[PDB]
Amino acid sequence: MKNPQHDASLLSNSNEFRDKNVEFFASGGTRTSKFDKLENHPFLGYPYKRGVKRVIQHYEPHVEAGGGEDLYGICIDIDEFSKTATIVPITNNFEGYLVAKDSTVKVKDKLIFNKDGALEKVKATINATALTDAKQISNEVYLVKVAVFGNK
Amino acid sequence: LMKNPQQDSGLLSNSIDFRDQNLIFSNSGGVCTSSKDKIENYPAKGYPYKRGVKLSFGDGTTELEVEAGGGDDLYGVCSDIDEFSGMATVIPITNNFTGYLTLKKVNPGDKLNFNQHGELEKVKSVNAIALSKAHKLTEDLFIVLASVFGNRA
Amino acid sequence: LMKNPQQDSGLLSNSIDFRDQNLIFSNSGGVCTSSKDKIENYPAKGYPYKRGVKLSFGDGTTELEVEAGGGDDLYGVCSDIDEFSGMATVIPITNNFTGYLTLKKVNPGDKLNFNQHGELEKVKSVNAIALSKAHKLTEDLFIVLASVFGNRAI
Amino acid sequence: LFDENYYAKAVANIIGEVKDPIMYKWFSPDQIEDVDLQMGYQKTVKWDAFLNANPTTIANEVNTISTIGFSSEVVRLNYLKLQYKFRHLKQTSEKFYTSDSYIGDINNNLLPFAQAYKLASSEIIKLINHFVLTGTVSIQKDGKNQKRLLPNMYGLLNMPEQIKEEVASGDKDKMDKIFEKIEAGLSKLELGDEFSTPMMVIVDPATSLKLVKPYAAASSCEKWEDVLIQTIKAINNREDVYIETSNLLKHKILIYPLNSELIKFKPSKYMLPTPNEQVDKDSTDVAHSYIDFVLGGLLATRKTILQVNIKQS
Amino acid sequence: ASLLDSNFVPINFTEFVQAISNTYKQRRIQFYENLKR
């Protein structure tokens, strides 16, 4: 889900300090500013580390995984008990690890959020730049460092 | 090529008048700065001072840098440089900016955009509006007060 | 292109060996110097350090200067430069010189002359003989120990 | 100040639990001299003399005499300031997250300020030790995406104009070949006047394990470590030869003297992590804190460090 | 000014930082004093 490290059989060795940050439980961004706008919204699904779009039905509007021309924000943290998601609006820029469509993402590649909330190689709607290569943390999950700055 | 004049002066500057004393190349930042502005710092390649910046990537041994440029690769506006550390202050294109920027070698209210070298020029995809006329500081150095408030359609 | 290294070194020098330690760009002057040598200081136009110099004339408002050159206009050899005052030390062609000079990008006994940029090149009008092989300080900087003793016939 | 600010009191009360850096074992007590500077440069001046030509024979009358030349060297050391930010729980919100045997939100990975600061300081000190040893700052195990640092900032493993030896990949497991390369490097070392000084060798665990094997029909009562100690004592005027093992090194052997006249460390007095006075506070229970640290200050004479790299395949 | 002493009352953050630096120096001095090779 979000933090699956609660299931373990032995204590980890806390000696190495390198290659220790590329993980799914890392919530937020690599570089964060004090003046970054964050909005908490109800969610339906698992939009963690994904582009989120607004859905309006009665109940208040809720964010769900998506992209394309419906992109509203990017989810950087999730609270399961309250069923809430912290979102950086598309107006604000972000830099951090996000989910990609597959492992075919390299440096200098322009990325686009798809209808499933995953980043895929390329016109383009938003300015997303892949700063690294996709990492195969899980069989289907591919985390990639991406800097998003507005829309084209 | 430098934020401050390279050659020292031989004359004491007289401080009597208070008008038109801000049209200098050493005026870093913006004329109107909000306390909620988002500011970043990057390694500097070349001299992107008072120019639009774009991300530049090397072989991979070192981190990414910022270099003068615009067009579709525009990432932000450089407003200050610390020369000792080679640090470039960047205001992202997602944040509104109002200040003096380099103009390509133009009346207020004219639409502007960034060229390949990060110099503002009269017009397509960048929301830049001139606020004054071109001010000449050197034979090839022209500045202009402009407001950049994102990217248009 | 500076007599003193413009970039500060990050290491302390190891002063142990006494051999082959004179092959630096800061070695101003000559390897063998006589106390009866004539020396003239001139205003410097450009960077004529360790290069053959020629007299350059302006519009008459200011005095003449010395600039890198050679051929039939050679006037002397620049052996030192004071950068603060922009002053070039010159030994006239009528006075012989022995020292390290810039070589155009060579074996002992080879006849050399000066090009238009004040650089030595293998061979016409100036008696210059290389006493050693070219030593490389930078990818575009080569020096050579040579003896210049006046001009020559034809 | 403690009454007005809680975070400073917590830092003062928890600063004692922070372990000492391991870089101290690589230098003598005299080889360290703190400097008062955060960011900037410090300059020193050295003078050298050299002979330009063969001497002049004084016979009869002669006016042209060979000259003795002089040179000046300016050495600059750069000091850079860096900062980290870390999130933690607000002081007035710990009671709502206290548990039976722990404090903090496991689900959202939130910790008290004291524990968060201790862990962050430990990580920063590990990074500082790595930078001191290798001359580079990077979080990847491949040594890529390194932070671009200012010039005149070097470590022991990347110091220029030093003696470097390479053991071939085909002889990676040949201790005799490794010792031959080490002997060549030791002969190429130039200590000069400062030779009666202790020596320090730093090796990877694999090389350390290879060292303890008996010297080789294999001999007895003598190890490769003993042979290396004797060989180094042959050049250090029969002085102490210390050997250390560091997991940071990888197929690297680093030999250098422990004399302050040849190699010195002048770190900033604020090099180790120091908390900042700015704390980001909001209407929620999450706050942000900043830690500052300074890097730079290694000085060494040229051709006084031996670095042996054993190529692997 | 040293954090090792239980008698130090920093007036401000500047004195606190100076005490932190002095404490680090004293700790490294003690480590070198107690170090045996």
DSSP line for B73-140: G--EEEEEEETTTTEEEEEETTS-EEEEEEE----TT-EEEE-TTS-EEE---S-EEE-S--EEEETT
Q: Which of D45, D50, D68 to mutate to test the interface with C (most CBs of C within 10 A)?
A: D50
Q: Do residues B153 and B124 touch, judged by C-beta distance below 8 A?
A: no
- First-last CA distance in chain C: 34
Residues 6+ away with beta carbon under 8 Å from A11: none
- First-last CA distance in chain E: 31
Q: Tell me whether residues D12 and E16 touch, CB distance under 8 A.
A: yes
> Virtual CA dihedral for B97, B101, B106, B110, nearest 10 degrees?
-20
Cβ-Cβ pairs closer than 8 A, B with D, add up to 25
Determination technique used: cryo-EM
Q: Tell me whether residues B94 and A149 touch, CB distance under 8 A.
A: yes
The CA distance from D225 to D229, in Å, is: 6
Identity of the amino acid at B62: T
Hey, what are A75's tokens?
């989810």
CA B24 → CA B101, B102, B131, distances in Å? 11, 12, 17
Please identify which residue in the block is written with the tokens 């690599």: A30
**DSSP three-state, residue C152:** coil
Radius of gyration of chain D (CA): 26
The distance from CA C99 to its chain's CA centroid, rounded to whole angstroms, is: 8
> Virtual CA dihedral for C128, C132, C136, C141, nearest 10 degrees?
-10
Q: Is the CB of D288 inside 8 Å of chain A's CB atoms?
A: yes
Which residue pairs, CB below 8 angstroms and at least 24 apart, start in D91-95? D91/D6, D91/D7, D93/D285
* Phi, psi dihedrals of residue A27, rounded to the nearest 5°: -105, 135
The CA distance from D144 to D138, in Å, is: 7
Hey, what are C116's tokens?
């238009």
Q: Do residues D2 and D233 touch, judged by C-beta distance below 8 A?
A: no
Chain A partners (3+ C-beta pairs within 8 A):
B, D
The CA distance from D168 to A82, in Å, is: 60
Q: Which of C5, C18, C34 sits opposite D51 (nearest CB)?
A: C18
The CA distance from D105 to D120, in Å, is: 18
Q: Tell me whether residues D139 and A19 touch, CB distance under 8 A.
A: yes
Q: Closest Cα to residue C27, out of C3, C2, C51? A: C3
Q: Closest Cα to residue B118, out of B106, B129, B126, B130? A: B126
Q: Closest Cα to residue D296, out of D35, D13, D27? A: D35
Number of H helices, E strands in chain A: 0, 10
Hey, what are C127's tokens?
């008696």
The CA distance from D242 to D258, in Å, is: 10
Number of other residues whose CB lies within 10 A of the CB of residue A121: 14
Q: Do residues C65 and C56 touch, judged by C-beta distance below 8 A?
A: yes
**What b/e readout covers B18-43, taking b as 16+ CB neighbours within 10 angstroms?**
eeeeeeebebbebeeeeeebbbbebb
Region class of B151: left (phi > 0), else alpha (psi between -120 and 50), else beta:
beta
CA A101 → CA A104, A141, B99, B127, distances in Å? 8, 8, 40, 32
Identity of the amino acid at D150: L
Tell me which chain A residues have a C-beta less than 8 angstroms from the C-beta of B92: 93, 149-150
* Residue spans of beta strands (DSSP E) within C35-140: 40-43, 52-56, 65-68, 76-82, 87-92, 97-102, 111-114, 120-122, 126-130, 135-138
Q: Do chains D and B touch (3 or more CB pairs under 8 A)?
A: yes
* Phi, psi dihedrals of residue A98, rounded to the nearest 5°: -135, 160
Q: Tell me whether residues A18 and D139 touch, CB distance under 8 A.
A: yes
Q: Which of E11, E15, E23, E28 to mutate to test the interface with D (most CBs of D within 10 A)?
A: E28
Q: Tell me whether residues D1 and E11 touch, CB distance under 8 A.
A: yes
Hey, what are D306's tokens?
């031996």
* Phi, psi dihedrals of residue D188, rounded to the nearest 5°: -75, -15
Tell me which chain A residues have a C-beta less than 8 angstroms from the C-beta of D143: none
Of all residues in chain E, the one with the smallest CA distance to D293 is: E21
Identity of the amino acid at D207: T
Q: Do chains A and D touch (3 or more CB pairs under 8 A)?
A: yes
C-alpha atoms less than 13 angstroms from C-alpha of A134 in its C-beta half-sphere: 20
Computed from CA positions of residues A100, A105, A107, A110, in that sequence, does the dihedral angle turn out positive or negative? Answer: negative
**What b/e readout covers E6-34, taking b as 16+ CB neighbours within 10 angstroms?**
eeeebeeeeebbebbbbbbeebbeeebee
**DSSP three-state, residue B56:** strand
Q: Tell me whether residues E10 and D8 touch, CB distance under 8 A.
A: yes
What H or E segment, with its residue span, contains residue D42?
strand D40-51
Q: Tell me whether residues D145 and B43 touch, CB distance under 8 A.
A: no
Q: Do residues D94 and D102 touch, judged by C-beta distance below 8 A?
A: no
The CA distance from C113 to C129, in Å, is: 9
Tell me which chain A residues have a C-beta less than 8 angstroms from the C-beta of D109: 3, 25, 27
**DSSP three-state, residue A41:** strand
What H or E segment, with its residue span, contains residue A112?
strand A109-113
Q: Give the DSSP letter of residue C149.
A: E
Q: Do residues D272 and D293 touch, judged by C-beta distance below 8 A?
A: yes
For residue D166, list its beta bridge partners: D309
For residue D44, list its beta bridge partners: D75
Tell me which chain D residues have a C-beta less than 8 angstroms from the C-beta of A19: 139-141
Q: Do residues B48 and B118 touch, judged by C-beta distance below 8 A?
A: yes
Distance from CA of A1 to the nearest CA of D (A): 11
CA C37 → CA A106, C90, C96, C126, D17, distances in Å? 68, 11, 9, 19, 73
The CA distance from A105 to D86, in Å, is: 29
Longest dimension (CA), chain A: 53
The CA distance from B64 to B76, in Å, is: 14
Residues 6+ away with beta carbon under 8 Å from D262: D191, D194, D197, D300, D301, D304
The CA distance from A35 to B35, in Å, is: 9
Q: Tell me whether residues D8 and E16 touch, CB distance under 8 A.
A: yes
Q: Closest Cα to residue B43, out of D271, D80, D132? A: D80
Region class of E34: left (phi > 0), else alpha (psi between -120 and 50), else beta:
alpha
Residues 6+ away with beta carbon under 8 Å from B59: none
Q: Do residues D85 and D290 touch, judged by C-beta distance below 8 A?
A: yes
Q: Do residues D31 and D265 touch, judged by C-beta distance below 8 A?
A: yes
Q: Tell me whether residues A27 and D107 touch, CB distance under 8 A.
A: no
Q: Is the CB of D36 inside 8 Å of chain E's CB atoms?
A: no
Sheet holding D274-275, edge to edge: D40-51, D68-89, D286-295, D274-275
Q: Closest Cα to residue C33, out of D204, D62, A142? A: D62
Q: Do residues D265 and D62 touch, judged by C-beta distance below 8 A?
A: no
Q: Do residues B22 and B38 touch, judged by C-beta distance below 8 A?
A: no
The CA distance from C147 to C133, in Å, is: 13
Tell me which chain D residues have a C-beta less than 8 angstroms from the C-beta of E19: 12
Please identify which residue in the block is written with the tokens 């007036």: E11
Q: Tell me whether residues B36 and A35 touch, CB distance under 8 A.
A: yes
Region class of D250: left (phi > 0), else alpha (psi between -120 and 50), else beta:
beta
Q: Is the CB of D130 inside 8 Å of chain A's CB atoms?
A: yes
Tell me which chain B residues have a C-beta less than 8 angstroms from the C-beta of A151: 151
Q: Give the DSSP letter of residue D82.
A: E
Q: Closest Cα to residue C102, out of C39, C32, C53, C154? A: C53
Q: Do residues A6 and D128 touch, judged by C-beta distance below 8 A?
A: no
The CA distance from A64 to D8, in Å, is: 42
Tell me which chain E residues have a C-beta less than 8 angstroms from the C-beta of D242: 37
Hey, what are D197's tokens?
């000084």
CA A114 → CA A62, A71, A106, A118, A126, distances in Å? 19, 9, 17, 6, 11
CA D45 → CA C9, C80, C119, distances in Å? 11, 22, 32
Of all residues in chain B, the one with the smallest CA distance to D137 is: B62
Radius of gyration of chain B (CA): 16
Burial of D239 (0-12, 13-18, 19+ CB in 10 A): middle
Q: Tell me whether residues D140 and A3 touch, CB distance under 8 A.
A: no
The CA distance from A119 to A116, in Å, is: 9
Of all residues in chain D, the one with the smallest CA distance to A3 is: D107
Looking at chain D from residue 44 to 63, which residues have their Cβ under 8 Å from any Cβ of chain A?
none
What H or E segment, with its residue span, contains residue B66?
strand B65-68
Q: Do chains E and D touch (3 or more CB pairs under 8 A)?
A: yes
Q: Closest Cα to residue D224, out of D243, D200, D249, D196? A: D243
* Phi, psi dihedrals of residue D124, rounded to the nearest 5°: -65, -40
What H or E segment, with its residue span, contains residue D125?
helix D113-134
The CA distance from C152 to D301, in Å, is: 48
Q: Give the DSSP letter of residue B12.
A: P
Q: Tell me whether residues D144 and B60 touch, CB distance under 8 A.
A: yes
Resolution in Å, one decimal place: 7.4
The distance from CA C153 to its chain's CA centroid, rounded to whole angstroms, is: 23
The CA distance from D228 to D222, in Å, is: 11
The CA distance from A73 to A63, in Å, is: 9
The CA distance from D244 to E20, in Å, is: 29
Q: Is the CB of C33 inside 8 Å of chain D's CB atoms?
A: yes
Q: Closest Cα to residue D241, out of D209, D197, D203, D181? A: D197
Q: Are strands A51-55 and A62-65 parallel, antiparallel or unpaired?
A: antiparallel
The CA distance from A136 to A132, in Å, is: 13
For residue D50, list its beta bridge partners: D69
Q: Which of B94, B125, B149 to mutate to test the interface with A (most CBs of A within 10 A)?
A: B94
Q: Do residues A49 and A143 touch, judged by C-beta distance below 8 A?
A: yes
* Phi, psi dihedrals of residue B18, rounded to the nearest 5°: -125, 10
Q: Tell me whether residues D49 and C15 touch, CB distance under 8 A.
A: yes
For residue A65, list its beta bridge partners: A52
Cβ-Cβ pairs closer than 8 A, A with B, add up to 35
The CA distance from D292 to D183, in Å, is: 43
The distance from CA D32 to its chain's CA centroid, rounded to whole angstroms, is: 12
Region class of D98: left (phi > 0), else alpha (psi between -120 and 50), else beta:
beta
Number of other residues whose CB lies within 10 A of the CB of residue C136: 12
Helix E13-34 / helix D6-14 crossing angle, nearest 10 deg: 0
Q: Do residues A124 and B125 touch, judged by C-beta distance below 8 A?
A: no
Tell me which chain B residues have a C-beta less than 8 angstroms from the C-beta of D137: none
The CA distance from A101 to A130, in Å, is: 13
Tell me which chain B residues have a C-beta less than 8 angstroms from the C-beta of D143: 61
**DSSP three-state, residue B65:** strand
Q: Which of D71, D263, D266 to mutate to test the interface with C (most CBs of C within 10 A)?
A: D71
The CA distance from C81 to C4, in Å, is: 10
Residues of D with CB under 8 A from a CB of C: 43, 46, 48-53, 56, 63-67, 69, 71-77, 151-152, 154, 159-161, 190, 192-193, 299-304
- First-last CA distance in chain A: 32
Number of other residues whose CB lies within 10 A of the CB of residue D133: 21
Q: Closest Cα to residue C99, out of C88, C91, C109? A: C91
Distance from CA of D18 to the nearest CA of E (A): 10
* Phi, psi dihedrals of residue D172, rounded to the nearest 5°: -65, -35
